[PDB]
């Protein structure tokens, strides 16, 4: 079919551990210091801003390596609206 | 939040970045407290020193990092809290009655 | 309204067995609407309204 | 190999309707290749300009009659298929036509445009017979290829035209009828070499040189397959919650239309109204909260 054409050239010319609090995600300095701002889970972690959540007296300028790398694999944003976050179960350790 | 929870998180804070050049003043930024409030509360619970606490284990982890690997001592000073080897060996002789060189030779 | 059985009723005829109220039982129906008008749940019955 | 590539050579233009194109060099059998394969392409896919929508005032439909005209009105639409007009740039031109008194309205009765080239102005369109006969039509001319009947346009466009817009089917194809022959081309050292004459006879509107330049353009692009290839919650309104009669007396007093407009405000922006635990009960169930900022809102 090249040869017929060469004749014509002169003629055309969800995740499971994302339902799971910060103590059980294979990590330990991203667990104990988030629940003391009434966010016991990843839920309000993604809406709230890391200029104030890190400014609270439990996080700081090294927690962004343990939030933004979480938000790399889980895709959530800064201020995002959650589709269905809370079940009936609420607990702690 | 009561105060006995914080020192449980304060000892869950420290043992993970000892190979880092870490100090007390970055703990106070992460814990939000001042630089002085860390050192009063450690005596109600441990009755030891928290200023030397982050300095004690840079001997104790160099008591196994030197012991297991083939690392020489003159890089331990620049990272694990000091500037020269003449002060790092002296803190060992107050803690565990030994010199660093004959600490490995004792099988 | 005569659903599910035979004898069509009056507002007093409910009151013989249940409760002899008159205008709360008349106001039952008014918020029976306001809980069931809802033309996004009743859109299925709005495909009956264009009959 | 010993291949040999052809050249366009001759345009022996016999008429404005009748033409002849020679072609050379061609090898053995390749005369029947390129004598045949153009012809099937040439007879269908040539884009031309043709009449589509003839519309006369004072005539309601194609089965009406108008006085001072000698012809029936459907037959005049059948006259108006045979119109060769050479339009160059655009694809839609609305010609206009007037005449008065006795005398046949022919194709030389149009108010011409610049890129409009009527080919055949001598063609008869009508025959006015009365002294007060004065016909006036508003013809759409288009530009297309292929065949479209009247009923194809009807279903494809649901938009309703005004009455009196009398359609005509779309005879676009501006070729009429071709033939060709295979004779020998006189190149010395290769005495098998063969030439090809493609006589083309058609109507106007087409220079027969460009008829085949576009015809290979059709074929050489279908070989390129061969020479290459071997949130609902956010838009939910206020009444779905079965909400309390006191607070629906207030959320309609605080002038909020959608739930996205409510979470556009915060919990602080609700407390100033008379007559928080209820929304903290119900928002935590179906996957909501408060305090969440929205941007690029509204999306209509």
Curated annotation (Swiss-Prot), chain A:
Q: Which gene encodes it?
A: rpoA
Q: What highest taxon heads this organism's lineage?
A: Bacteria
- What stretch or stretches form a coiled coil here? none
Give the start-end ranges of region Alpha C-terminal domain (alpha-CTD): 14-93
Q: What is known of its domains?
A: The N-terminal domain is essential for RNAP assembly and basal transcription, whereas the C-terminal domain is involved in interaction with transcriptional regulators (such as CRP) and with upstream promoter elements.
Where in the sequence is N6-acetyllysine found?
61-62
Instruction: Please give the family membership noted in the entry.
Output: Belongs to the RNA polymerase alpha chain family.
Protein role: DNA-dependent RNA polymerase (RNAP) catalyzes the transcription of DNA into RNA using the four ribonucleoside triphosphates as substrates. This subunit plays an important role in subunit assembly since its dimerization is the first step in the sequential assembly of subunits to form the holoenzyme. Part of the processive rRNA transcription and antitermination complex (rrnTAC). The complex forms an RNA-chaperone ring around the RNA exit tunnel of RNAP. It supports rapid transcription and antitermination of rRNA operons, cotranscriptional rRNA folding, and annealing of distal rRNA regions to allow correct ribosome biogenesis.
Q: What transmembrane ranges does the database entry give? A: none
Subunit comment for this entry? Homodimer. The RNAP catalytic core consists of 2 alpha, 1 beta, 1 beta' and 1 omega subunit. When a sigma factor is associated with the core the holoenzyme is formed, which can initiate transcription. Both the N- and C-terminus interact with different regions of transcriptional regulator CRP. The rRNA transcription and antitermination complex (rrnTAC) consists of RNAP, NusA, NusB, NusE (rpsJ), NusG, SubB, ribosomal protein S4, DNA and precursor rRNA; S4 is more flexible than other subunits.
Sites of ADP-ribosylarginine modification: 29
At the highest ranks, the source species' classification is: Bacteria, Pseudomonadati, Pseudomonadota, Gammaproteobacteria, Enterobacterales
Protein name in the entry: DNA-directed RNA polymerase subunit alpha
PTM field: Acetylated on Lys-61 and Lys-62 in the presence of glucose. PatZ controls acetylation of Lys-62 but not of Lys-61.
Swiss-Prot record, chain B:
Report the main location listed first in the record.
Answer: cytoplasm
Which chain regions cross the lipid bilayer?
none
One Gene Ontology cellular component annotation? Answer: cytosol
Pfam families, alphabetized: HTH_18
Query: Where is the DNA-binding region?
Result: 25-46, 73-96
GO molecular function list: bacterial-type RNA polymerase holo enzyme binding; cis-regulatory region sequence-specific DNA binding; DNA-binding transcription factor activity; sequence-specific DNA binding
The UniProt entry's GO biological process terms, in alphabetical order, are: regulation of DNA-templated transcription
What residues does the HTH araC/xylS-type domain cover? 8-106
InterPro entries in the cross-refs: Homeodomain-like_sf, HTH_AraC, HTH_AraC-typ_CS, MarA-like, Tscrpt_reg_AraC-type_HTH
| Protein location | Cytoplasm
What the protein does?
Answer: Transcriptional activator of the superoxide response regulon of E.coli that includes at least 10 genes such as sodA, nfo, zwf and micF. Binds the DNA sequence 5'-GCACN(7)CAA-3'. It also facilitates the subsequent binding of RNA polymerase to the micF and the nfo promoters.
What is its induction?
By paraquat.
Q: Which UniProt keywords apply?
A: Activator, Cytoplasm, DNA-binding, Transcription, Transcription regulation
Q: Name the domain of life.
A: Bacteria
PANTHER family associated with the record? REGULATORY PROTEIN SOXS, RIGHT ORIGIN-BINDING PROTEIN
In Swiss-Prot or TrEMBL terms, this protein is called Regulatory protein SoxS
Question: What gene name is given for the protein in this entry?
Answer: soxS
Swiss-Prot record, chain C:
Enumerate the subcellular locations listed in this protein's record, separating them with semicolons. Answer: Cytoplasm
Q: Where is this region: Interaction with anti-sigma factors?
A: 22-37
Q: Where is this region: Sigma-70 factor domain-4?
A: 1-38
The residues that make up the annotated DNA-binding region are 11-30
The family this protein is said to belong to:
Belongs to the sigma-70 factor family. RpoD/SigA subfamily.
What does UniProt say about this protein's domains?
A: Contains 4 domains, connected by flexible linkers. In the active conformation, the domains are in an extended conformation, each making extensive interactions with the RNA polymerase catalytic core. In the autoinhibited state, sigma-70 factor domain-1 packs closely together with sigma-70 factor domains-2 and -4, contrary to the extended conformation that is seen when the protein is part of the RNA polymerase holoenzyme.
Q: What the protein does?
A: Sigma factors are initiation factors that promote the attachment of RNA polymerase to specific initiation sites and are then released. This sigma factor is the primary sigma factor during exponential growth. Preferentially transcribes genes associated with fast growth, such as ribosomal operons, other protein-synthesis related genes, rRNA- and tRNA-encoding genes and prfB.
Q: Fill in the subunit field for this protein.
A: Interacts transiently with the RNA polymerase catalytic core formed by RpoA, RpoB, RpoC and RpoZ (2 alpha, 1 beta, 1 beta' and 1 omega subunit) to form the RNA polymerase holoenzyme that can initiate transcription. Identified in a complex containing RpoD, the RNA polymerase subunits RpoA, RpoB and RpoZ, CRP and DNA. Interacts with Rsd; this prevents interaction with the RNA polymerase catalytic core and with promoter DNA, and as a consequence, promotes transcription from promoters that require alternative sigma factors.
Q: What is this protein called?
A: RNA polymerase sigma factor RpoD
